[PDB]
């Protein structure tokens, strides 16, 4: 009972210590997880901006196709 | 005091066991979190490469516009 409830104390000491760092690593891995979610948005936003600029080249290229074909027809007429 | 400090031992056993797996799941959820951060970079890099190739189409389309308008003017002059 003497050094018996002593071994208990030891395990509990080590334990509280283990539960200590884990409560810190979860701190670290929570701002990271946090920052991971803010970058995902940036990338997403970038992807939207890009598509916006892509929906425009396709547009510009569509009118070019017209501009050029009208010139080509004309020259075939004389 | 006898089987009293016995119940203690049991809780501590189960406990150390619980603190065992958590110290493993945090292992698993740390290489994942790790890999999640290396892919974010790939995607980012991909997004940069893409934009590089996009900044070029817009360029090519800009000169085309010129190429075509000069041909069109000319033909309006005779």
């Amino acid at each position: 009972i003497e050094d018996k409830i002593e071994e208990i104390l030891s395990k509990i000491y080590h334990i509280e210590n283990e539960i200590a760092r884990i409560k810190k690593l979860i701190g670290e891995a929570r701002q990271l997880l946090s920052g991971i979610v803010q970058q995902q948005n940036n990338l997403l936003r970038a992807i939207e901006a890009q598509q916006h600029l892509l929906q425009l080249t396709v547009w510009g290229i569509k009118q070019l196709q017209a501009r050029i074909l009208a010139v080509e027809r004309y020259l075939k007429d004389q | 005091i006898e089987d009293k400090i016995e119940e203690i031992l049991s809780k501590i056993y189960h406990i150390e066991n619980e603190i065992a797996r958590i110290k493993k799941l945090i292992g698993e959820a740390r290489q994942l979190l790790s890999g999640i951060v290396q892919q974010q970079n790939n995607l980012l890099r991909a997004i940069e490469a893409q934009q590089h190739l996009l900044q070029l189409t817009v360029w090519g389309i800009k000169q085309l516009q010129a190429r075509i308008l000069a041909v069109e003017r000319y033909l309006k002059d005779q």
């Binding site: 990271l32 991971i36 970038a46 425009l56 | 980012l44 900044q55």
Partner: peptide, 29 residues
């Protein structure tokens, strides 16, 4: 059609520091 292109350099620049940071922290784990 600075409009979308200057908004992207922004996003990508901004999306460079974070990626640069996230990895730092990930190491300090």
């Amino acid at each position: 059609x600075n409009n979308y292109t200057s908004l992207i350099h922004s996003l990508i620049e901004e999306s460079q520091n974070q990626q640069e940071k996230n990895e730092q922290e990930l190491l300090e784990l």
